[PDB]
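ugh ok so i messed up the first submission bc i forgot one of the chains. this is the corrected input, ALL of the components this time, i swear. 740 residues overall. if the numbers dont match what u have on ur side tell me asap before i send this to the collaborators (the ones from the other lab, u know who)
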Amino acid sequence: MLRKQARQRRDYLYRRALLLRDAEIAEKRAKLRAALASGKPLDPKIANDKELRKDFDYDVSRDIAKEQGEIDIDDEYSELSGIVDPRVLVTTSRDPSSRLMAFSKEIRLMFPTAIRLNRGNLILPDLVMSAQRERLSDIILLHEHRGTPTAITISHFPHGPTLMASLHNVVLRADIPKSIKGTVSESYPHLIFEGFRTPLGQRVVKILKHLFPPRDPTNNAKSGNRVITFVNQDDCIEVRHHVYVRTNYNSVELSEVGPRFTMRPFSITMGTLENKDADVEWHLSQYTRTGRKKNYF
Amino acid sequence: KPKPPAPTLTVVSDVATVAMEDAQPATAQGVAGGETSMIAPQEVYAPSKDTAEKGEVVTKAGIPIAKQEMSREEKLRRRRREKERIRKAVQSSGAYKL
Amino acid sequence: SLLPPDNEVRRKHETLLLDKLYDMGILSTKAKLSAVEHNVTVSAFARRRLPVVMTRLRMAETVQAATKLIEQGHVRVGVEEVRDPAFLVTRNMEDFVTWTVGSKIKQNIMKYRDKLDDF
Amino acid sequence: WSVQTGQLLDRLSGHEGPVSSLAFAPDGSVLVSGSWDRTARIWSIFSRTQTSEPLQLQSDVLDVAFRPDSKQIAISTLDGQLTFWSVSEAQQVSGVDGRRDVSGGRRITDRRTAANVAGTKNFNTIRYSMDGTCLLAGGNSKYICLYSTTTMVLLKKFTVSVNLSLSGTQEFLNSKLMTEAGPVGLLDDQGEASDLEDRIDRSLPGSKRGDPGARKKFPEVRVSGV
RNA sequence: GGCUCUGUGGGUGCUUGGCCGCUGGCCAGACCUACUUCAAAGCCACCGGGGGUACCUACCGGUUGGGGAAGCCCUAGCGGC
RNA sequence: CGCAAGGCUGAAAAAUUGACGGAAGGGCACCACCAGGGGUGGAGCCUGCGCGCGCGCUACACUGACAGAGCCAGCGAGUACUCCCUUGGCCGAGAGGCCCGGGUAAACUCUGUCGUGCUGAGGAAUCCCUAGUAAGCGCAAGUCAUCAGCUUGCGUUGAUUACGUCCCUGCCCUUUGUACACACCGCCCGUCGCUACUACCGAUAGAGGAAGUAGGUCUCCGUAGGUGAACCUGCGGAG
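and heres the new structure output, hopefully the right one now
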């Protein structure tokens, strides 16, 4: 099994590098197809390449399929997108506190298909090993400061990305009394994402919305009574968890049911939780000059 | 990896299973076997709305009941059950004043 | 290629052909038909053979030594011992080619690593 | 999957390798899987808790069989050994090391002595008796073994074929058939055929599992099912 | 006395003779070269992919000059259609 | 540069598909039952959140103290790491450097010496937990966010009790679909909307109000015609 995970990760990295070179060529091939249909004259370096024309005659059709959106990009999520229900386990750090364990339970209840695991004495490579051995889609690690959580680590499996984020303004479910709160409904939640516009924003949108099981698309625009909101300002994604009734065709009553975060991501690594030496995709550039001026996501 | 599954339909007849059997001097089945007609009674005849009469309806039980003999309460309840399945899937001054 | 470019059966059989060749390990990408133009190659089949793929997996040192070892019969692919040095190892059986049960080559590797368990 | 529903119930998981043998218990309560992670699993599916008790073995699992009175199970590994486990308290109660009892070999295209050929020294398939007292075991070899499950002895060994047109039916080939160009049953003699459809070799290079070309000259002896 | 190397014979599949121009002969061989009525039925027959086609070849349709099997007819001929 | 760029104005629907339920039957859950375990809450310290609240940390004795003997880990190596500040004196024209004072485990195992002695294990509640899990123990690191009032790893020792059931509390879903054989089941229920039609009521042909329903082949012969020997067609007869 382990040889298959290593081999498939190496094949994925090689295919991504080949896609970089092929994109450098296919930016030139899309000018030849647009000039053929519209008749505007093109560059001589493009029109006088015999290899480009000879291979263009075979590779028209994938460019047309990408224009129509009929195919999907080579990704770690596009293999099993809406086919499998993504199972995900939430774990603490090594010796958790009682409020960290209740918070772990609360963000377990945020996902309708998640499970929680007691860490105890569990070495982190064997944690990764057991996740790949039970075909989990995601793990989420939690770190507390002193009864208040300060970091999440959302890792996608078998070889997918980590998003490590630091938590702020955490208002737990376990602070309000049982007369006012209650047992959270476990229905498949709607999701809304607000303010993600860069390709890095669509990356974090993908690795956050593939944590939830896929919604049945027959009548999802009106059915379902539970929503989860990820909205970012100043690249600190703030998340709420509401439950709603549609009290009229023009009005809706919301009710806050879950914990509130404003998590800020500081590391997105193309590689799982065990790989400390995985190649990062983005990291929070503090101690640079304009790293506080520039806004990502 | 085998192939993507593409739909293929097979036309079976109403002959007995000893017509699907291979060629040999006598059958392997007994005398009771050999009358099984290779399509079930549900494929010989199934009562449904597309093969019902004009005045009558067929219920979920497969029983013809007519709309004339059906009462108002049962008509209302059958309408409610079908609707439940569907849900699961310048003038004059006198005219102004007076 | 000679089919028109917006054709449904052209697109479906392009994806089928590229997925079949990438699953057999001949092509290294599954997103270009020019790979089947000038990258599918009898050398690509011949390097998907067994002694070259275990040379790459470093089961042997050279393809000559690998052909000698799989003629003497130390190498199984999966669960069955392989005596034919032309057995084309696909991309998901390159994860299952390994030594046989009572192999002297396996005892040599364990004796080098000082893990020679005689049980 | 479910038979009366038709759609997929579950994907059970916990194996670190491809799963080679499956067996549902004849009373109906326990699935047992056996896989090349050197492991077996007592899956309990039908209870309200769905649980998996592992049985750690010494090599890759090749076959799994139940006793008819379901308290016992025999799993045959790649070392060539049969291990008789209990299913209630998951402990091995019995075992046979059966390499020598099934090792009969030396095919053509085999440069080892028949005693040193590994690959024909395991039991690919095993079945209990309908009594439940004797296993029957057969692999990729000439011999079928019939073991006793209580006294752990080989009651009787059989030879499947005397046919020398098959390849692995005698463990000591004679040196009369070895020319200076390899064995005599190895030279390609298709060219001395009167008919073209017999002369044409439409065979694929390196195809162990079937090709429609299928030269198939001197096929091996193997018992693929008992 | 021991290791190694090499050679011959038997065995490594159920035991019916050596040879020939073989119903008979021979193992020391013998005789040497005859006899003849009417050439033949057709088909298939594996070169890696895309492309060129001036020349050669294959297939198909024709053109000049000769050739006449066979079919048809009758004024009968060295005939005629 | 042109259009956008002129205020019956003055803040707080759709529906033959819709709105809300009920009853029955399933599935699941340490936010449920059942059996146990462990926190917090009592005293002190303090980060944090808004004097209060918890989260950690410490003290609180049989599981004792003292002295010996023996025996066990894993992660950890950037010419890099250091706990203060000072009384004196050395060599110091001066700035400093010296010297001397003051403030690779824990655990475990075995053998002896003494014996409960301000020398006291946390209420109501509330929360969490089902196997290398709870709990004890130390060692190491400090990785662009968080974290020294701590964080995260890493090894060591390692149990009790459930592992059943939807009875309580709930959550999800069936009563439409999504496949066909065996086999089984057999029209779930209510309050309204919308649409179509029908008639009613009363003010000025008309917008409203209120309601209901949904059977002669073959051969021959005699004929008559055709293109004549023959031969063809049609008919009438016999075999």
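quick check: Strands of chain C lie at 75-77, 80-81, 97-99. that seems consistent at least. DSSP finds six helices and three strands in chain C.
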